[PDB]
């Protein structure tokens, strides 16, 4: 009885299971942006839908009066920092049209691929999980990390491990011993 640490079943399924075009359209997304699950998509869709839900419940009220203006702006501020929303569009009514595809292209997954490094997309997810890639001076092994647009530039290979060039790749310790034997 400290307190129930709250949580959410955050990421929530669609209300049918077999809309053929959705089943493809979700595959397309998991193929383009390399997602192991449908979950990874619904995760974004819900995470996004929560925002949308705010935007609707702000746009119901008059933008000029307080919450509408403040919470809406803070909601926009949040998105532009996370880098989904453009700098062309900061008008709340544009937040309403954000979509899942724009959210995914902001993940650390993709911003590896968009800055080169990996080649062929998935490789990044593998690099990320395999403890390379440091956004700050701090390793990240979540693919779905959401990059901060400000921090985008700081994405490089880790101080530790290969590719940064500290230690080469764990079959060298095999063949450096094997070549020394010959």
């Amino acid at each position: 009885p400290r307190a129930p640490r709250t949580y959410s079943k955050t990421y929530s399924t669609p209300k049918r299971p077999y809309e053929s075009a959705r089943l493809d359209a979700e595959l397309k997304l998991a193929g383009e942006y390399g997602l192991k699950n449908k979950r990874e998509i619904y995760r974004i869709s819900f995470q996004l839908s929560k925002i949308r839900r705010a935007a609707r419940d702000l746009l119901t009220r008059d933008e000029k009066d307080p919450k509408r203006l403040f919470e809406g702006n803070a909601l926009i501020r949040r998105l532009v920092r996370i880098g989904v929303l453009s700098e062309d569009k900061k008008k709340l009514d544009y937040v309403l049209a954000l979509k899942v595809e724009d959210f995914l292209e902001r993940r650390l997954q993709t911003q590896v691929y968009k800055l080169g490094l990996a080649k062929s997309v998935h490789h990044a997810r593998v690099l990320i999980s395999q403890r390379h890639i440091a956004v700050g001076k701090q390793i990240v092994n979540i693919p779905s990390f959401m990059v901060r647009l400000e921090s985008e530039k700081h994405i490089d290979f880790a101080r530790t491990s290969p590719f940064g060039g500290a230690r080469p790749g764990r079959v060298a310790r095999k063949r450096a011993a094997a070549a020394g034997g010959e």
């Binding site: 009885p1 400290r2 307190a3 640490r5 307080p66 403040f70």
Partner: protein, 260 residues
């Protein structure tokens, strides 16, 4: 059940401790004393969560045993003494005296007060009554009873208290156009002037109180504490000074002020 309650469970812990949801099933029950359960502040919260002079309750306990801590002149060794509103807490090692005063948000604040002024405690009324030997006596909402007061120290009117001796330095009357600090929930820790006093028969005396910014607000009398006449409040108040800004106003001041 079966008489008074000895524990206080942390979620039930009054919010203006700013006690931590986790890191303990319980909260420190403020012990019995001059200030009401929720309106008090037990020293564990003061010395640990607020000031961080202790890293845990143990160290607070010892800090009170060695004994430089002196809440309102007297020493205290009580981990959960009701150090409520106005209570001058003087730590003689460091010389860091603190008056207990509400931040505009509502939650109490560390005000790193002078030698010096932390020497009187402002205190309200309460009573006016008389006791035995026909002695007229005054009582402070903020704890103490003081004997033989000036006849025209009336009710809901403040009194400066000598604190170390515990007598009467001076008093501020309650009436129209007098700087008034606030101690009631939503308007808690705001400051203002006083315009009206709706008398009201039975159902609580109201007071219409314009701040520096002249945003009017109403409270009840019981939640109002006359800090002086306008311009000169008798206590040194924290940065913010009882204004209470709007939400966007606070967001503006934060993201404007970025000095790395």
């Amino acid at each position: 059940a079966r008489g008074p309650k000895k524990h206080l469970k942390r979620l039930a812990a009054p919010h203006h401790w700013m006690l931590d949801k986790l890191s303990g099933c319980y909260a420190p029950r403020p012990s019995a004393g001059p200030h009401k359960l929720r309106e008090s502040l037990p020293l564990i919260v003061f010395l640990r969560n607020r000031l961080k002079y202790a890293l845990n309750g143990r160290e607070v306990k010892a800090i009170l045993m060695q004994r430089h801590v002196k809440v309102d002149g007297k020493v205290r060794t009580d981990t959960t003494f009701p150090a409520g509103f106005m209570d001058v807490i003087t730590l003689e090692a460091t010389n860091e005296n603190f008056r207990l005063v509400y931040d505009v948000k509502g939650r109490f604040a560390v005000h790193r007060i002078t030698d010096e002024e932390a020497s009187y405690k402002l205190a309200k009324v309460k009573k006016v009554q008389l006791g035995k030997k026909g002695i007229p006596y005054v009582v402070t909402h903020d704890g103490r009873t003081i004997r033989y007061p000036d006849p025209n120290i009336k009710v809901n009117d403040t009194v400066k208290v000598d604190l170390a001796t515990g007598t009467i330095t001076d008093f501020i009357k309650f009436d129209t156009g007098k700087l008034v600090y606030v101690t009631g929930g939503r308007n808690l820790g705001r400051v203002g002037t006083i315009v009206h006093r709706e008398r009201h028969e039975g159902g609580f005396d109201l007071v219409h109180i314009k701040d520096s910014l002249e945003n009017t607000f109403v409270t009840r009398l019981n939640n109002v504490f006359v800090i002086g006449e306008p311009g000169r409040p008798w206590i040194s108040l924290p940065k913010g000074k009882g204004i209470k800004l709007t939400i966007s106003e606070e967001r503006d001041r934060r993201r404007a002020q970025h000095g790395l």
